[PDB]
């Protein structure tokens, strides 16, 4: 994709993951855990929410009948209707086609920057404390227990508190 | 001690295209052109006029199956096939401009031309073909004009009628075209025919033709229509010396109305804002699938079985 | 510690514009794609124009009073105005748009004298009190009412034909008269029976005179109705007639193209524009307009759109 | 937004850098001061002014009338003449709505990314001399006066030059 | 230090591409979206086609000696050319362009006889020296021109009705003489009034015998009006007249749809193709084209547009 | 561009890398070398191909002749069909014109996106035992012969075995 998390570096998704778009993993001491980040998962969602509301809203045109149903039409003019009616379809039908397939080329590579803006997120937050493992993963170079994970998912961890640990373990 | 980030996916994912790409697979998607049709007219919160066996026409002239349809008002208008407009045989000429107009109507009013003819000419002519509760009849807003003395000339009778009202009137007559020599010399004598209709934007003559012809319900001989606006103020004179089916009133259009072809049953309980031959189509989808003719306000057409578009990322399982 | 920080421009408050995402969207600049504006007049600067006043561009081909300064020319651009005249004696062309579209799309308008001469027994110099010249009865300038010369008397059988000795098409008008009675009818055109034949090789057509009762038109039960054809270089019209034509004493050629306009906007003389419509002139340089679906020239394109608004800036995010 | 730096890890514009649309901002021993970039800003105008040109450039097609403003039309004819109309009416507002909300997501996004370029061309000129803060700033861990600074607007740093200081500075020597 | 640096490729020269935001944008390859160049010849391979050459597509249902070889056939492709003759004799169709239409949209004719008779007091084999055979004097092979078995006497009054017995409609033609002259017409038919009337159960009209002077178009003054209707299956038409009338002795059955081509441009039965136009094939997967608005077949669309390049490669960032 | 590298922070092409899209050039003790990378060439050549594939799938639109070439068309109608017509010209025709710019744009920004994608790729590899220049290289701390440049082009680079000789190179002991 465009921004190479999704189907890229994220070599997969989660099935097990059902109370969000995007989220976190970890794992320390006490064990492993799992929770979805909100404010990624709603600009996702209301990005999509948008293009829904466009797709729906009302064309008021109203169009009247220029063809009877159930009577002959004069042959010259039935040609004309037949031809003008058909080069209109091959315009909607392009229309539609292109629509869809731009609009799609556009949902699936927003939802890939926006997981990639959620991983340069904690980057940043994690500053010297930690480093990529190239998978999507941070590996933290301190202690951290779940109230110091919960930390960094409610985006409150302060690098200074454990850059003197994560330091030294980075270079023995 | 590690932090992994990532997102969801799911068992089943769906295909969609995209630039790039015919054979996608994302999370999920909607669809975007409308494949179902309700085979039924939803007609709740429309004044609606069901026609059945009435052709539009038929109202504006008066066929025996428009009786209850001679006046009314309207939004929406429903015809049905094999509709009768002239139970003696005939045809309008512009008859599908003439259909339109009052397809595109919110009523009719009618109004009387007050003709009224002289001892020598008879216009209580009637016909086996419109029949009324089993007693011979005709066209109920005209009149037949024939000599009372069979074999003698039509006599040079003029008839005007003029628009007081401040909108325009739709005026019908009717030009009668024998089956033979012996037959037109019957009616309206042994002279040459002309029928003149001038009004001040409008002027044109009319010549029964006379020839054996094919029996069309029993009756070789035709009856022919043709019609003109009156506008206000304006009057319209009728100089014809035989074979004039002239109008004892004349239409009047009203408003605007939706003119539907549809054989599909009528239900009051669903609406809808656009229909076709085989119903009514409900949707939020902006293109459809069903028909290329539709009227009312309608999704657009396209040859299209589907189009999904993606509501979700690339699904990428386990 | 000292830091060095990076950032983007804002203001107060941007406009606002939609996206593929977000209806209402704020930016810091944006600009209208859609043209609401026009001027009520008709800009004619650097077009060689003819305004037609209460002349009706049909009325040029057969010389009605009111187009008498209209018979010849040459110009760019033809404007129409409501309720302009065709007729002074009451009648219709048949295939009276197709005729006036042709008009409006040429360029000029130059007359041809048909030489048309009759026997001592024609008064070619039929008039009426519907077309009037300085209070005197007069007739369309390009035509000619043919009665008999002597009342009651009948109208012989005339030929007239008419030859394009030219290297374009010619356009032929005449008329056909439909007199009030039969009692009228006689004393014009004697007790005959009365057709009229036209025929060019590319046209051929019979008519005979209506006669009936019918409303006046200006005191005028009579009618005039006319028809046209178009007579190739090199090719001949001839009219078999006995009574009822009205002739033509001279053809008409269409010159070159112009556009045309159909208004009552006024005429000004210093703005320049290559789009019009009823309301007057539009000359802006962007893509879309929402004044009129019916307009003419090199437009715009028409929308059902208020406003579309184009960013022409970043997200803007106030402080 | 797609990049995340606009209305993303930057949490609002400058409503005072009224000369550039995009610039920096520095504090030391000195002083603060504030600057705009003139290549970055150029960038985004440019593809602007490509757009606008695009928009404002003329279809020539001639058209002429088929409707009559004065006279009456036939009604079928009319009838098909307004159906096409209508339809031709139709398709344009759906292109033109159609052109400006993909083309607004593009300057939008376009704007964003001139942004990210620009952090990141700084990020890499810096090397080891600095940390990011997470908010668009750049922690500079030595001396950097008024002339260093401009050196990293100019472009004209020399990493080398400071990186023991900054290295020690970064581990507490 | 050791290094990796990473790359991407450039060449010599690129090609010039459009984008978004510029016109200029050079990338390393590109194709052509809007096909220019035409075969200017037509491809028929694996179409049963019918060049129709001289003839006129009308001339095949009435018999003019240029379409003697195409009053009946079959075929999915029907080809016509520039000043192809429909009438060795001069005259026109009423709604001609309909009928044209009509025979351009099929796939093949059958021919299907009247079987109208005549009485000794008519000559039913009238002829003349504009449509030739054989050097002699003929006439439209799928009628007859009736005319007084005497010169000068009256034509007897007579009723033909041809009755369609076929499981679909069938396509009935007729014509009408026009005389040149007055003593011509009652040399014919005679000196009686001439009424033509024709009636079907949805069709009835009456017709008139245009007596009148006129070009010579082929050497002949005359002219031969031809009016057609469509005969349903079951239905019967009834044809009275006393003269003037030029009566069919068979009509036409269109069967199956076919494709027709307007164009003077050669024929190749070795390329195939779906598209056409009057200067000849169009072969192309592209979607768009320039060389003509008028095609006719399954073709890309018209744009006015000389070349759109698509860029098939990234940024051109040469060294 | 949008994604900073084609014609960005990757200052030229390479006019000698004849095998792919997107590749690599290395130094070492031993000299230099030359490779192109697969995957990343063939996402942007599958990608274009899909565009191509879009492109020229047809419509079997039959359509059939409303004008003559050889007679005339009676006035009005043929004023009908030409405005009709040049309609649909003007639609498609801009239509045409926004596809190949909107396409261009986007093919464009997508090389951009995949010459990201790779260096980004190699990057998180190399860990803390490079360091970038900036130009699109990555300048190693320590001896990388053949065989280590082949396993950070074939992903298979373990950063651990050089992370103490490259942390000392670049902290300076
Ligand atoms: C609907 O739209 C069609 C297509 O635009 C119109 O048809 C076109 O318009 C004109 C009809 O009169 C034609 O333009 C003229 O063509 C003359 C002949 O030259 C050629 O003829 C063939 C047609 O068989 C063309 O394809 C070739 O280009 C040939 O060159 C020109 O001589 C003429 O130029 C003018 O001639 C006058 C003489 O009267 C000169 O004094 C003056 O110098 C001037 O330049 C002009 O260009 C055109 O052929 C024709 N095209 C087609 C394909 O039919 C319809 O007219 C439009 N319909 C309506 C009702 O408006
Ligand atoms: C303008 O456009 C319209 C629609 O495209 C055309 O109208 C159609 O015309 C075609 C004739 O070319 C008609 O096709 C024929 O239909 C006959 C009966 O079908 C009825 O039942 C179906 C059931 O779904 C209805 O949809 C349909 O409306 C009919 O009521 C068939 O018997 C015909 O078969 C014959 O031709 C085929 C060719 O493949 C042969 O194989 C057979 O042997 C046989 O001879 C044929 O299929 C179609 O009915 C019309 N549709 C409508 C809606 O009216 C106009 O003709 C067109 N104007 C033109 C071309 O000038
Ligand atoms: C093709 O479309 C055109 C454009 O829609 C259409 O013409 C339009 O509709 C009617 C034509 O009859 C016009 O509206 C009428 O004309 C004027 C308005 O200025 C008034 O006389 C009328 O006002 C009535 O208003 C009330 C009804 O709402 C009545 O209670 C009252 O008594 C008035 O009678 C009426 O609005 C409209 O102006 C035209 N538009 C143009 C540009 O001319 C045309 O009918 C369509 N063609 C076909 C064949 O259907
Ligand atoms: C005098 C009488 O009773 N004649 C009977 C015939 O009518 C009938 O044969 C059929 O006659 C048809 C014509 O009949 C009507 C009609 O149209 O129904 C009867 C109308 O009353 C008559 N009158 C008026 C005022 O219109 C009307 C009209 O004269 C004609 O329509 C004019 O065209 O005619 C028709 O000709 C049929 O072809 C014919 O079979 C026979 C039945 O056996 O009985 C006769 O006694
Ligand atoms: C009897 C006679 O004089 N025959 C020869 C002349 O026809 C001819 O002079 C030319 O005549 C032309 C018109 O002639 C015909 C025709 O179309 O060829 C002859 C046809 O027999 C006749 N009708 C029928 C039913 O057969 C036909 C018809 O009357 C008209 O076409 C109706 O308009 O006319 C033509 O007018 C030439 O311009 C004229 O010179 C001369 C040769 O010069 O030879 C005569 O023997
Ligand atoms: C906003 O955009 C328009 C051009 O679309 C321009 O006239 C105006 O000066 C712009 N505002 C600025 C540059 O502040
Ligand atoms: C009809 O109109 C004409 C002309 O306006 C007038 O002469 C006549 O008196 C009018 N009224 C009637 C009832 O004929
Ligand atoms: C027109 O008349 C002349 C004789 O004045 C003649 O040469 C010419 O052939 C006639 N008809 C046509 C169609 O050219
Ligand atoms: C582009 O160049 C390639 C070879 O580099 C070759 O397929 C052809 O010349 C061009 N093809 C396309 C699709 O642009
Ligand atoms: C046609 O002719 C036959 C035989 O004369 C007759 O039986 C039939 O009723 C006529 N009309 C039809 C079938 O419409
Ligand atoms: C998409 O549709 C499916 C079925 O309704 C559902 O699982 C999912 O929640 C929907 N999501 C959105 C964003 O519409």
């Keep these: 994709?465009?921004?190479?998390?999704?189907?890229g570096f994220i070599e997969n998704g989660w099935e097990g993951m059902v109370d969000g778009w995007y989220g976190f993993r970890h794992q320390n001491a006490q064990g492993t855990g799992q929770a979805a980040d909100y404010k990624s998962t709603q600009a996702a969602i209301d990005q999509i929410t948008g293009k829904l509301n466009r797709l729906i809203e009302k064309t008021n045109t109203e169009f009247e009948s220029i063809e009877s149903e159930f009577s002959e039409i004069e042959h010259q003019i039935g040609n004309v209707i037949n031809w003008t009616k058909d080069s209109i379809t091959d315009i909607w039908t392009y229309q539609a086609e292109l629509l869809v397939a731009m609009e799609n080329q556009h949902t699936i590579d927003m939802a890939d920057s926006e997981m990639l803006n959620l991983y340069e997120r904690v980057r940043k937050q994690l500053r010297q404390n930690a480093e990529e493992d190239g998978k999507g993963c941070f590996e933290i170079y301190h202690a951290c227990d779940d109230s110091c994970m919960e930390s960094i998912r409610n985006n409150t961890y302060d690098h200074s508190q454990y850059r003197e640990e994560a330091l030294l373990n980075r270079l023995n | 001690d590690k932090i992994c980030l990532g997102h969801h996916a799911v068992a089943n994912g769906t295909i969609v295209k995209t630039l790039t790409n015919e054979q996608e697979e994302v999370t999920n998607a909607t669809e975007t052109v409308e494949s179902t049709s309700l085979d039924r007219l939803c007609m709740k919160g429309r004044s609606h006029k069901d026609l059945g066996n009435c052709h539009p026409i038929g109202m504006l002239i008066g066929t025996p199956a428009c009786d209850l349809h001679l006046t009314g008002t309207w939004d929406t208008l429903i015809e049905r096939e094999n509709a009768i407009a002239y139970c003696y045989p005939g045809a309008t000429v512009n008859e599908e401009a003439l259909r339109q107009k009052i397809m595109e109507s919110g009523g009719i009013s009618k109004i009387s031309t007050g003709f009224t003819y002289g001892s020598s000419i008879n216009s209580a002519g009637t016909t086996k073909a419109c029949m009324?509760?089993?007693?011979?009849?005709?066209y109920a807003e005209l009149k037949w004009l024939v000599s009372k003395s069979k074999g003698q000339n039509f006599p040079q009778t003029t008839?005007?009628?003029?628009?007081?009202?401040?909108?325009?009137?739709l005026i019908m007559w009717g030009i009668h075209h024998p089956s033979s020599t012996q037959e037109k010399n019957d009616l309206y004598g042994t002279q040459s025919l002309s029928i003149s209709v001038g009004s001040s934007t409008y002027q044109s003559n009319f010549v029964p033709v006379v020839g054996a012809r094919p029996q069309v319900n029993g009756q070789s001989g035709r009856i022919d229509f043709h019609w003109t606006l009156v506008q206000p103020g304006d009057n319209i004179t009728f100089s014809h010396n035989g074979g004039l089916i002239a109008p004892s009133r004349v239409s009047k259009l009203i408003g605007r109305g939706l003119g539907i072809q549809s054989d599909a049953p009528i239900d009051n309980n669903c609406e809808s804002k656009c229909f076709w031959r085989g119903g009514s189509i409900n949707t939020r989808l902006p293109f459809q699938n069903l028909s290329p003719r539709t009227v009312g306000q309608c999704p657009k057409y396209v040859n299209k079985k589907s189009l999904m578009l993606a509501t979700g990322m690339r699904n990428v399982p386990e």
């Design chain 1, 1 to 7: 994709g465009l921004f190479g998390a999704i189907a």
């Design chain 2, 132 to 138: 009324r509760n089993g007693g011979n009849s005709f």
């Design chain 2, 159 to 169: 008839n005007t009628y003029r628009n007081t009202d401040t909108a325009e009137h």
